[PDB]
Design a protein around this ligand. Sequence first.
Ligand SMILES: Cc1cc2nc3c(=O)[nH]c(=O)nc-3n(C[C@H](O)[C@H](O)[C@H](O)COP(=O)(O)O)c2cc1C
Ligand SMILES: Cc1cc2nc3c(=O)[nH]c(=O)nc-3n(C[C@H](O)[C@H](O)[C@H](O)COP(=O)(O)O)c2cc1C
Lengths: 307, 307
Amino acid sequence: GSMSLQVNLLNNTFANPFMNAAGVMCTTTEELVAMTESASGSLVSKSCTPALREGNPTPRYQALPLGSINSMGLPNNGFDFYLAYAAEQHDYGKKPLFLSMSGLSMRENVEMCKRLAAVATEKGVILELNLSPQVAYDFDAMRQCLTAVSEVYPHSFGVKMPPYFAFAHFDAAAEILNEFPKVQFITCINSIGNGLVIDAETESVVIKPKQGFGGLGGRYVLPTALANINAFYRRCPGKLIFGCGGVYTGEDAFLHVLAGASMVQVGTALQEEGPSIFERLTSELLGVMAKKRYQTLDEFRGKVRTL
Amino acid sequence: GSMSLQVNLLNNTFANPFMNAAGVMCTTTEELVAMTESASGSLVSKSCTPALREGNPTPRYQALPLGSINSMGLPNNGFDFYLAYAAEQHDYGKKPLFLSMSGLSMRENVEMCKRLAAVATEKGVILELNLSPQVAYDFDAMRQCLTAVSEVYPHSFGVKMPPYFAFAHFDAAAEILNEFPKVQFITCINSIGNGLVIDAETESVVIKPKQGFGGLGGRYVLPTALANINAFYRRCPGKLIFGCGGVYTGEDAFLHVLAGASMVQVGTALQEEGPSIFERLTSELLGVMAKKRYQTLDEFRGKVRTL
Ligand SMILES: Cc1cc2nc3c(=O)[nH]c(=O)nc-3n(C[C@H](O)[C@H](O)[C@H](O)COP(=O)(O)O)c2cc1C
Ligand SMILES: Cc1cc2nc3c(=O)[nH]c(=O)nc-3n(C[C@H](O)[C@H](O)[C@H](O)COP(=O)(O)O)c2cc1C
C-alpha cells in the first residue's frame, strides 16, 4: 500500500529523515549545493568557528574496513561563510537547513549565536550546537555552555553529543539537558573518541595528528550510537533525538528509528559514497518498511522491544 | 629463525603472552583446568565477589558478527572457591595464575585481599584487581580504592581498566596509577560499556538485563583497546600493560604488542572457539613474526611508529 518517509518536527516538514553528519561533505559551497540537490531530507553545514580554520596536518582521515578514524581539527570556512550561506544562498524551498557551530570557547559560541539569531528568525536555519576533557565529558563545562547559549540565543536549537558508556552518565547528561527547554533535539552520537588504528603492514598509525589517536565512525560505532539514541530517547521524553553513527543501509537507519531517532545522519558511509547515497538509503528504508508492513516512521519510532 | 614468544614479568616466565580474559571460560573448576591444560601462556580466574553470585537473568550474552554484547552480572563461585583453586589445586608447574577480584565495595576488596595475601606469598598467584558510573570513571574513588588495597596487600598486583576516550582522562588515570608502585601491570581494556544491539528481524534487543544495554567486546573494540594500551604504555613507563580487546588472530595480537602489550588476553574469540584457540594464536603470531623478521616480542613491543 502507501508508504512515507516524511518527518514533521521543529515547525518543518522533511521528505525523509536522512541528512549528512556535521563535518562530512558540507564544508564548501559546492558541497552544500550538492547536499541540497541530493535526495536527503535535510543537511547540516560543517561545524564552524568564528574565523576560517586550516585544521590538522594530513593524513587526518583514513577509511577502514569497519568504518573510519579521523582527527580533522575543525577545518572550516568560518562562521561568516556558513551564516551567509544560510542567509542568502540556501534554497529553503528544497529542504530545511541546520547550521553546526563549534566555538573554541564559551565566548566564541556566545558571539556567533548573537549574530545567528536574526538569520534563524528570518530564514529559519536551525542551530546544531556541537558539545562533543571535551565539553560534554565535563558536566560543569556542559551546563555552562548551554546556559550561555540559552541566555543569548532566543530560539530553539539542538545539541550534538559525544557517546557515553555508563547509565550514571546518561542520567547526569539528561538531567542537564532537561533543564533547558530551548534544547529541542539531541544528536547522538559524535565519534567514539580517541581510538588508535595500527596498520600491521607498516607497523604504524594511519593518521598524523595526536600520535595516531582519532575519532572512530562507521560500523565500529553502531551499537554505541543506538545505546545513546535510546538512552536519551527514554530520559528526555520532551525532546527529539537525531541519530548519528554507523548508518550504511536502510536497515541500519531502521535500527536508529526503532531506538528513537527522528532524523538520521550519515557520516562515514557518505564520505565513501558521495551524496548519491541518499537515493539508495531512501529506497532501502522504504524496502525494509514494505517487507515489515510499516507505512510511516511514527509507527515504529522508539518501539524497540525489551526482553 | 630461532623465535620465542617468551615473556618474563613479575618474577615469572611465561611461554607465550596469551591468556583468557577474566570472565571468559574460567568460572568453574572444569574451565580453569582446561585453561591450564591449554596452550595459553597463562590464565585468570573469573572476577570474584566475597560470596557466590548467580548473576543476571538470561539471555545475558550474545555473539555477534562483529563481536559480542553481554550483561553477565558477575556470576561467580565466590572468593573462597578461587582462593582454594589458587592455594591447593592449580599446577603452577604448568603456567602462572592470575586471580581476578571484583568486590562490590572497597571494604569487600580489602577483606578479600587480607586473605589473598598469604596465598600470593606462598603459592605465587597474582592479583588482577577489577576496577571496571563504576569505579574507574571516578578518579578520587579510584585513588581511595588503591590506597585501601595497598595498605593491606603486601604484594605486586595489576588493575583491570575500563576504556577511556579522552587524553585528559588518560592523564588523570595514569597519574593516579603512578602513585602506586605496587600496581605493576595495567590491563586495558574491559568492555566498551553499555552498547545496545537491536536485531532488525525481531525488532528487539538481544539480552535481557538493563533493557538490552551491555558491554561490547570483539572486533568492535580493537582500536579502543589499542588506544588505551598505548595511552597507558606511554604514561606509565614504570609498569607493564596487558592488552585485552578484539584479539581473534596472531596479527591482532601483533598489534596489541606493537601498542605496548606484554600479555595479551582473549575474550570473545575464546568464548566462540574454546581453549584450542591458543594453539592457533601462538602459531599465527610466530608466523607473523617470521614474516616480519622478529625473533622476540620485546624487539617490537611498544614500537608502533607515529607520523
Ligand atoms: C571527516 C569527519 C569530519 C567530521 N566533522 C564533524 C564536525 O565538524 N562536527 C561534528 O559535530 N561532528 C563531526 N564528525 C562526526 C560525525 O558528524 C559523526 O558524529 C560520526 O562520524 C559518526 O557517524 P558515522 O558513523 O556515520 O561516521 C566528523 C566525522 C568525520 C569522519
Ligand atoms: C561473557 C563475558 C564475561 C566477562 N567477565 C568479565 C569479568 O568477570 N571480569 C572482567 O574484568 N572482565 C570481564 N569481561 C570483559 C573481558 O575481560 C574483556 O575485557 C572484554 O570482553 C574485551 O575483550 P574481547 O574483545 O577479547 O572480548 C567479560 C566479557 C565477556 C564477553
